[PDB]
Design a protein around this ligand. Structure first.
Ligand SMILES: *C(=O)[C@@H](NC(=O)c1c(-c2ccccc2Cl)noc1C)[C@@H]1N[C@@H](C(=O)O)C(C)(C)S1
Length: 352
């Protein structure tokens, strides 16, 4: 590819792999709408399979960008509304604390302290009902943001309900297919197992385990190729043929709440571009939010991104719609979010 692109990429990621002792990594850079690929290390140390443009990485929380979009698509389809109480799609949600809790609240982590992880002992639909029924809000809805799987995850599950499709049923046919992401899955087919990389946590090959609402919050696995297309799709949403998926993408990039200089979308998070590097280990930051009334439409001059991880994988997606620029980073080792963002900024800012 262009030697300029080739050079920041290699000069930033190389030491990054060395300092963080990252087994395998994949990187895509979207320059003026064209993807450039890079690959290092191993997808499976034991079998010496290297990382390739075909390797599957666990996206972790980056999965929330898909849930965000799929939900925006359901809104566009008129199957759900963000202004609707959560009880509309789950009538058995009788506890009185759900009253003024809307789908917008679930989707944006502002319901009032929904826990970061759904408890491991919640292993059944009925288990899931009781958990949400018995949850006690630490705060009033629309006052604080506490990032959580159990918040966005229930939103994903409720958003596809009117449709009658499973979440994965809706994801495939309403988002992966339309977008030609043929190597992106919530569940990896046996046919793709030879591309599924192992994650590395403390020296052992690990894969994410099943959990409640896992497909909706941290479940998708994908290649740098499909991720590149995913970034391409979120950069230029007007070039998408299926009309609700177009609207859906834009809605996910809308600004619903503001905290510091960070804005909260559906899955995606945004910062006004140009952005200061200072701005971009605290397992839990509760942050009050200012409501953006009404929500601002997706802003070209943003730095839209999202981190995500699992026991064995660390990933990051960042793109500036206005510069038609973007990057994707996928490693099979969970390493410091900050190093991810530094590397992202260094590459991208060096290309305008
Ligand atoms: C998304 O990636 C979320 N994490 C998980 O669901 C998850 C983790 C994990 C990894 C590092 C630190 C904490 C946790 Cl819980 N391990 O397995 C799973 C399924 C949340 N998003 C993360 C992010 O923004 O990168 C966190 C750390 C805020 S937790």
């Amino acid at each position: 590819a262009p030697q300029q692109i080739n050079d920041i990429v290699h000069r930033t990621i190389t030491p990054l792999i060395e300092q963080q002792k990252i087994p395998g990594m994949a990187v895509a850079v979207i320059y003026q709408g064209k993807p450039y690929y890079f690959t290092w290390g191993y997808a499976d140390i034991a079998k010496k399979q290297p990382v390739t443009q075909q390797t599957l990485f666990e996206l972790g929380s980056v999965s929330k960008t898909f849930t965000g979009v799929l939900g925006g698509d359901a809104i566009a389809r008129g199957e759900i509304k963000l202004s609707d109480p959560t009880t509309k799609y789950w009538p058995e949600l009788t506890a009185k604390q759900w009253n003024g809790i809307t789908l917008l609240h679930l989707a944006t982590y502002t319901a009032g302290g929904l826990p970061l992880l759904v408890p491991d002992e919640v292993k059944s639909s009925s288990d899931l009902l009781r958990f949400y029924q018995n949850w006690q809000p630490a705060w009033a809805p629309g006052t604080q943001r506490l990032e959580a799987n159990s918040s966005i995850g229930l939103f994903g599950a409720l958003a596809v309900k009117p449709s009658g499709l499973s979440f994965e049923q809706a994801m495939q046919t309403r988002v992966f297919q339309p977008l030609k992401l043929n190597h992106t899955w919530i569940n990896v087919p046996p046919a793709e197992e030879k591309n599924y990389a192992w994650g590395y946590r403390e020296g052992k090959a690990v894969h994410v385990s099943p959990g409640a609402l896992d497909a909706e919050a941290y479940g998708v696995k994908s290649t740098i190729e499909d991720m590149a297309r995913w970034v391409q799709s979120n950069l230029k949403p007007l070039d998408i043929n299926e009309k609700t998926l177009q609207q859906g993408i834009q809605l996910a990039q809308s600004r619903y709440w503001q905290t510091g200089d960070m804005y909260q979308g559906l899955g995606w998070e945004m910062l006004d571009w140009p952005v200061n590097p200072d701005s971009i280990k605290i397992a839990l930051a509760a942050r009050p939010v200012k409501a953006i009334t009404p929500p601002t439409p997706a802003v070209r001059a943003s730095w839209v991104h999202k981190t995500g991880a699992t026991g064995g994988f660390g990933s990051y997606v960042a793109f500036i719609p206005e510069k038609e620029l973007g990057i994707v980073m996928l490693a099979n080792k969970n390493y410091p979010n900050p190093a991810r963002v530094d590397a992202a900024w260094q590459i991208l800012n060096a290309l305008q």
